[PDB]
């Protein structure tokens, strides 16, 4: 009552993972992404992966 028109606008936000986002496992290991490290600097196995 008292409203002649109802206007709605939906906005979709695609949010990538970034520093400060909260990640957690299924065992209570919550945490905050501190650094997005280049794949060249990240530890690699004997197979180069």
């Amino acid at each position: 009552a008292g409203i002649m028109k109802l206007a709605k606008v939906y906005i979709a936000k695609k949010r990538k993972l970034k520093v400060g986002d909260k990640m957690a496992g299924r065992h209570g290991n919550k945490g905050i992404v501190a650094r997005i490290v280049r794949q060249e600097d990240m530890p690699f196995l004997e197979d180069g992966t």
Partner: protein, 229 residues
């Protein structure tokens, strides 16, 4: 002039190499130099090599990436994520950017090879990659833009202010190297068994040959180390 007794290699030897995998050797090396050369080359290979990927996509009748094309099982988001996976190898020299208009109809599956009949300057290296499943009566008219870049450029940076309406920018993973693995084995030269032998295993996407990738990484390393003259 004191560099007399440092045993330096003569060449780099290619054991086995395809357009996608290559195995290389580097010997003889002074102790500790194998790790230096291998790690520098691995970092430059996984970091700075150029490549080709898609920057913009426009599907007819689709205004935003959160919509659906009639008759297509996959939404526009999944189509975009699949389009991100297409790999290109340059066929015509000096071609840095190309606009491809794609019109596919009468098929039950849109594969990356269907883009090849419309692409002139680039070659699709994985034509078996499925973009989307459609009905036999679905006509798909899409426009993709292929550009040259390095590393990773997010879709936010790829957004052009003069792009036509309905153009959807996409994330671009330009890197051509999938994996670099190196090993260091001892090598015996005459009486000394302490010399080192370097083994290189490079997996590429096919856009750049492993030997060419090694050469370009070495070129970057030389360009960086000349500045200390």
């Amino acid at each position: 002039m004191a560099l007399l007794n440092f045993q330096k290699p003569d060449k780099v030897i290619m054991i086995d190499s395809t357009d996608f995998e290559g195995k290389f050797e580097f010997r003889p090396l002074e102790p500790g130099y194998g790790l230096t050369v291998g790690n520098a080359l691995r970092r430059v290979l996984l970091s700075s090599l150029e490549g080709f990927a898609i920057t913009s996509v426009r599907i007819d009748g689709v205004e935003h990436e959160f919509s659906v094309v009639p008759g297509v099982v996959e939404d526009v988001t999944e189509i975009i994520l699949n389009l991100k996976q297409v790999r290109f190898k340059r066929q015509i020299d000096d071609v840095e950017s190309e606009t491809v208009s794609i019109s596919v109809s009468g098929k039950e599956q849109l594969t990356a090879g269907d883009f090849q009949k419309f692409i002139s300057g680039y070659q699709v290296l994985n034509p078996d990659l499925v973009i989307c499943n459609m009905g036999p009566k679905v006509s798909i008219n899409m426009e993709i833009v292929i550009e040259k870049g390095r590393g990773y450029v997010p879709a936010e940076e790829n957004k052009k202010s003069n792009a036509p309406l309905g153009s959807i920018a996409v994330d671009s993973v330009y890197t051509p190297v999938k994996n670099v693995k190196y090993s260091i084995e001892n090598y015996r030269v005459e009486q000394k068994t302490d010399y080192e032998k370097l083994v290189f295993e490079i997996i590429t996407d096919g856009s750049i040959h492993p030997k060419d990738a090694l050469t370009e990484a070495a070129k970057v390393l030389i360009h960086h180390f000349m500045l200390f003259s």
